Paper text:
Gene repression by DasR is abrogated by several effectors such as, for example, GlcN-6-P. In addition to the regulation of the N-acetylglucosamine-related catabolic genes, DasR also participates in global processes like cell development and secondary metabolite biosynthesis.
The structures of DasR-EBD in complex with GlcN-6-P and GlcNAc-6-P were solved by X-ray crystallography at 1.65 Å and 1.85 Å resolution, respectively, in order to characterise the effector binding of DasR. The sugar ring in each effector is recognised via direct and water-mediated hydrogen bonds involving residues Tyr98, Glu154, Glu193 and Tyr238 as well as via interactions with hydrophobic segments of Ser97, Arg221, Glu232 and Val234. Interestingly and different from NagR, one protein chain from each DasR-EBD dimer binds the phosphorylated ligand in an α-anomeric configuration, whereas the second chain preferentially binds the corresponding β-anomer. Binding of the small molecule effectors and the concomitant rapprochement of helices αE1 and αE5 considerably reduces the volume that is available for GlcN-6-P- and GlcNAc-6-P-binding to a mere 90 Å3 per pocket.
Residue numbers in the entry:
A (entry chain A): 87 to 252
B (entry chain B): 88 to 251
The structure:
């Protein structure tokens, strides 16, 4: 009953199409925040710099799957907030509006528990182990584009990696 | 909180690459009979003999994970004393059997700590654990191991580099 998701630099939209599921989203919160030192470092901006934060509930065939909170430089992408009225895919929006294409990313996978609000939104018991992901992505020019923190349903996901030994 | 980068490396290698000292306790080792599932994973007959190895993994001194390894008993005579000799299963495989891992599929998912696991790992029953399952094949294309590891959710982080 779990989606088996390959670990690769792909969008949620791409990932769900690969599963033969229909991706939809509910915009939970969107707006600008000021970067602290941590976030400024992750986005290569000056501390105090403005960050577009996008929080979305991602669904598959209508069922909650994940809550994603992505962070981008507002200075680099000042029309991106409005462009998400037009695009359902952030990665598509980046490519079409700004000709930005992701090339490399570091992803982390951890497990812990949801907040009460997250559990409510995902329709899971608050004691259910969840998959807490982060993704730090850079584009073809080597600039960091996004820093994402996410909560994926522990009862709906496993991730799969291919390993190679030289 | 060990942030462990993912590639086909041994626990031993992973620990040394982080300055941490790799230490393990051998909990149990013995034969089991393969069901169809395990027989498929190890390319043996549905009633064949599997070596199951249970190990406690410690990062420095503190419990980190319980690792359950499955291999074909027929293919690896005297694996028990070989593991004792080399400590690293991957070192034993290479030095003793001339078996070298080439690729693996690793699954990452969540689970809850069982009473046995909570006891061994010094944690509480029913708290989140990261569960990794590794299916590895050697340079001849044969499966070598099927491994299931349960990590303390509060101490372990899986890291992957993604490329498009
Ligand atoms: N884990 C990634 C996120 O880091 C990324 O922000 C999202 C964009 O998805 P989309 O282009 O559908 O909006 O895709 C994946 O889910
Ligand atoms: N998850 C893997 C497992 O598949 C593998 O057998 C094990 C080998 O480690 P070692 O006994 O130190 O050679 O490394 C673990 O991290």
């Amino acid at each position: 009953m779990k989606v088996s998701q390959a670990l690769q630099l792909t969008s949620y939209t791409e990932d769900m199409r690969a599963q033969g599921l229909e991706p939809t989203s509910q915009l939970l919160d969107i707006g600008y925040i000021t970067a602290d030192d941590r976030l400024a470092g992750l986005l290569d901006i000056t501390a105090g710099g403005r960050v577009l934060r996008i929080e979305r509930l991602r669904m598959a065939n209508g069922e909650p799957m994940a809550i994603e909170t992505t962070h981008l430089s507002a200075k680099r992408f000042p029309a991106l907030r409005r462009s998400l009225v037009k695009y359902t895919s952030l990665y598509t929006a980046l490519a079409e509006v700004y000709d930005v294409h992701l090339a490399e990313a570091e992803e982390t996978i951890e497990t812990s528990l949801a907040t009460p609000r997250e559990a409510g939104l995902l329709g899971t018991d608050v004691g259910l182990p969840m998959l807490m992901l982060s993704r730090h992505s850079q584009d073809r020019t080597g600039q960091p584009v996004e820093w994402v923190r996410s909560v994926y349903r522990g009862d709906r996901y496993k991730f799969v990696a291919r390993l190679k030994r030289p």
